Amino acid sequence: ERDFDVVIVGAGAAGFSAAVYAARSGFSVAILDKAVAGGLTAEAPLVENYLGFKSIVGSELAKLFADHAANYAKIREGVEVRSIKKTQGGFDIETNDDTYHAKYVIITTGTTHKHLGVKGESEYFGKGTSYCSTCDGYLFKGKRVVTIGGGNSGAIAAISMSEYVKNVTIIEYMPKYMCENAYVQEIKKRNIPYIMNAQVTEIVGDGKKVTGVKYKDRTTGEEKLIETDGVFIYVGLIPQTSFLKDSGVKLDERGYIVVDSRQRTSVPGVYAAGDVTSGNFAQIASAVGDGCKAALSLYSDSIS
Amino acid sequence: KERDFDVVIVGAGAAGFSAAVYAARSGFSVAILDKAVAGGLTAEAPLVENYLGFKSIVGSELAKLFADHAANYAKIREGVEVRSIKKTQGGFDIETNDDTYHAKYVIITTGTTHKHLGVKGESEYFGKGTSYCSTCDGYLFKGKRVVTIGGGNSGAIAAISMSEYVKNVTIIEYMPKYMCENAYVQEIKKRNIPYIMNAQVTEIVGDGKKVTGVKYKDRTTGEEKLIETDGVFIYVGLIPQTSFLKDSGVKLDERGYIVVDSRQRTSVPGVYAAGDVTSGNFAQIASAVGDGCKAALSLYSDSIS
Ligand SMILES: Cc1cc2nc3c(=O)[nH]c(=O)nc-3n(C[C@H](O)[C@H](O)[C@H](O)COP(=O)(O)OP(=O)(O)OC[C@H]3O[C@@H](n4cnc5c(N)ncnc54)[C@H](O)[C@@H]3O)c2cc1C
Ligand SMILES: Cc1cc2nc3c(=O)[nH]c(=O)nc-3n(C[C@H](O)[C@H](O)[C@H](O)COP(=O)(O)OP(=O)(O)OC[C@H]3O[C@@H](n4cnc5c(N)ncnc54)[C@H](O)[C@@H]3O)c2cc1C
């Protein structure tokens, strides 16, 4: 049970979508995830732009995704892929488990949360600093929090947290709102301060817990300190493509897997879709769509 | 009563709806124009089981959910048909069958229309047994004999869905082998639904008032046979809804589909497209939603700089 027609790496929106179509296309399919299934979708506080769901908590939506995919593929949680190399008869997937064999592969490993790189970030990790609001937002009920990064992720994180924390403050590097207008309105509606043009210089605390965050205005230099209890960091993503070393699948300057209009990688038989691919739009809807494409594109070629 | 919007989306189908939600959340005033009532081809899908999140759901049901979702973000003008798109200084002029609409940007999501067989009796029997939508007219032949021309995914699921209330169903595929995904192939065999292959329909026959049967010539032996059916459903292809684009400047491929880049941009600045209308599309709700999402986000991205 380590041999399948198609092996998909990553149990997230893209992967799940690819699975259902791979199966329905008549292929035996296996989805391998280095952790429990769900992907970043499970960490989404509230999803309102996935067609068909007016408003659904990410973890809940991820549950529906997985259960849907479950009816067509074997979901192997806890299996991390470390390499992929083609062989005359498919490919070999070296894992933290054993070794899997597939004729075709679809890489849907998404991304990881980027780090800020400032004094006190490493030190206070698990001491008031977090990269997942849905995971640790509860810790700060009735408390003060600062969200570093005002993009769509940071915006909804803070918007959702403001429901139960004492107060939320958003600190954005760019001299403008980086989150979609729907969040801009919601943020202004809940009176959530959104500090733009601010560069965080330091996360500070009492050696035990976080007590505040230092940031300076990029233009005037004015440095300021704001006291909170929790600091959540949403300042970017990183493609999870490290396991593709010596695989032959081309990547762009930032680590993303380059693919053609039919989700094909530079390596015959290997397809990719989702937040992991180059130029992706970072949404569940596009991942689902592109995961669909990869699978049908896979089939299309399978029939010569 | 307004005709001016930051962005006009042409076509209220899966792609248009997704694009609408995204364009609206990005701050734009949005309007979705459809020549008929909203829903698009999704509403004619008997049973959708490959759109992530819904294990199984009747097409008409999913379309409603889509429309209700989109309505919260845009104005859906049913019964308005775009006849042309012309670029002006302020953006675009969109001539319809209900005055000219104006928009800064436009997204084309008009999908496709069903293709016609082109055989004798197809016209003269339309509405008298002939049809291109089983979800629409299938229930009429509940208990009678039927034949669906075309064994693609659409035709297949049409036959599979009807076999639940009809007498019998015979598919007639032009290509030699099965042309529908494996999931449908094993459903057909299970239900014992005949799947005549390498058959080329030559005529739809009836008694002048109602359809009685269809004649086809096996592309191999060259012969010609006949089958007893009350109703016939046609799913032999699709045509891009792009004729209204004549002289607009938007590049179409040799088959009429809009050609777009990786960011859903057509050849005309300010005009984007997504869904079954785009050349190379995979003809699924999922990818339609996905590209609709991209088009709107791409449109937003280009609006700033
Ligand atoms: C706070 C927040 C809010 C968001 N809100 C929205 C929203 O409202 N709307 C929206 O459309 N999107 C939203 N998103 C984004 C959305 O969640 C992502 O776009 C989507 O999850 C990407 O799907 P994916 O399948 O490409 O990858 P991911 O979901 O990132 O999944 C990749 C999977 O592969 C696994 N994996 C990685 N490397 C390996 C390996 N080497 N071997 C095996 N398995 C591996 C991972 O463990 C993971 O489960 C939000 C994200 C965040 C963080
Ligand atoms: C029987 C059948 C079963 C199917 N089953 C599945 C399935 O299980 N899974 C799946 O993923 N897909 C399925 N599909 C396909 C799916 O329905 C389509 O891929 C999807 O609807 C395409 O979306 P779209 O937005 O591109 O266009 P459409 O939904 O086709 O919508 C285009 C819209 O634009 C309008 N329009 C056209 N021209 C104009 C104009 N000039 N002015 C104004 N409005 C205009 C139309 O009236 C229409 O409402 C099925 C299709 C059929 C026929």
B291 contacts in chain A (CB < 8 Å): 286, 289
B82 close to B244: Cβ distance less than 8 angstroms = yes
What is the nearest CA distance from A188 to chain B, expressed in angstroms? Answer: 14
Q: How many CB atoms lie within 10 A of CB A104?
A: 24
Most distant CA atoms of chain B, gap in Å: 66
Q: Classify residue B224 by its DSSP letter.
A: -
Q: What is the resolution of this structure in A?
A: 2.3
Q: How many CB atoms lie within 10 A of CB B149?
A: 26
Of A12, A10, A16, A19, the closest CA to residue A81 belongs to A10
Residue B135: strand, helix, or coil:
helix
Cite the annotated binding site of B for FAD by residue number. 15, 34-35, 41-42, 50, 82, 112, 276, 285
Q: 223-242 in A: which are within 8 Å (CB) of B?
A: none
A290 contacts in chain B (CB < 8 Å): 287, 290
Given the candidates 3.40.50.10490, 3.30.70.2740, 3.20.20.20, 3.50.50.60, the CATH classification of the domain at A1-113+237-304 is: 3.50.50.60
Instruction: Please indicate if any CB of chain A lies within 8 Å of the CB of B29.
Output: no
B282 contacts in chain A (CB < 8 Å): 292-293, 296-297
Candidates A51, A53, A181, A256, partner chain B, best to mutate (most B CBs within 10 A): A51
Domain B115-237: CATH superfamily, name plus number:
FAD/NAD(P)-binding domain (3.50.50.60)
Of B284, B184, B163, B199, the closest CA to residue A290 belongs to B284
Give dist(CA A141, CA A162) in Å, integer.
9
Instruction: Please indicate if any CB of chain A lies within 8 Å of the CB of B249.
Output: no
Of B82, B79, B42, the closest CA to residue B60 belongs to B42
Instruction: Please indicate if any CB of chain B lies within 8 Å of the CB of A180.
Output: yes
In the chain, the amino acid numbered A141 is: K
- Contacts of B276-280 spanning 24+ positions with Cβ under 8 A: B276/B13, B276/B15, B276/B41, B276/B111, B276/B112, B276/B238, B276/B240, B277/B11, B277/B15, B277/B108, B277/B109, B277/B110, B277/B111, B277/B112, B277/B240, B277/B241, B277/B242, B279/B252, B279/B253, B279/B255, B280/A261, B280/A262
Q: Closest-lying ligand to the alpha carbon of A97?
A: 1
Domain boundaries, given as residue ranges, for chain A: 1-113+237-304, 114-236
CATH level 3 topology of B1-114+238-305: FAD/NAD(P)-binding domain (3.50.50)
Give dist(CA A183, CA A199) in Å, integer.
21
For residue B81, report the phi and psi dihedrals to the nearest 5 degrees: -110, 125
In the chain, the amino acid numbered A86 is: K
The reply to whether CATH 3.50.50.60 applies to domain A114-236 is: yes
- CA distances to A262, B294, B295 from A280, rounded to whole Å, are 13, 9, 12
Residues in contact with B52: Cβ distance below 8 Å, sequence separation at least 6, in sequence order = A13, A16, A17, A20, A65, A68, A69, A288, A291, B286
Strands A99-107, A3-9: pairing kind: parallel
Residue B90: strand, helix, or coil:
coil
- Record the tokens describing residue A81, joined without a space: 């892929």
Torsion sign (Cα): B103, B104, B109, B112: positive
Where chain A is discontinuous (C–N > 2.5 Å), the residues before each break are none
Q: Classify residue B289 by its DSSP letter.
A: H
3-state secondary structure chain A: CCEEEEEEECCCHHHHHHHHHHHHCCCCEEEEECCCCCHHHHHCCCECCECCECCECHHHHHHHHHHHHHCCCEEEECCCEEEEEEECCEEEEEECCCEEEEEEEEECCCEEECCCCCECCCCCECCCEECCHHHHHHHHECCEEEEECCCHHHHHHHHHHCCCECEEEEECCCCCCCCCHHHHHHHHHCCCCEECCEEEEEEEECCCCEEEEEEEECCCCCEEEECCCEEEECCCEEECCHHHCCCCCCECCCCCECCCCCCECCCCCEEECCCCECCCCCCHHHHHHHHHHHHHHHHHHHCC
Write out residues with Cβ below 6 Å of ligand 2.
B 10-16, 33-36, 40-42, 44-46, 48, 50-51, 81-82, 109-112, 154, 157-158, 241, 244, 275-277, 283-286, 288
What is the nearest CA distance from B85 to chain A, expressed in angstroms? Answer: 27
Secondary structure (DSSP) of B236-279: S-EEES-GGGTTT---B-TTSPBP--TT-B-SSTTEEE-STTBT
B131 close to B150: Cβ distance less than 8 angstroms = no
What is the nearest CA distance from A224 to chain B, expressed in angstroms? Answer: 30
Q: Do domains A1-113+237-304 and A114-236 have the same CATH topology?
A: yes
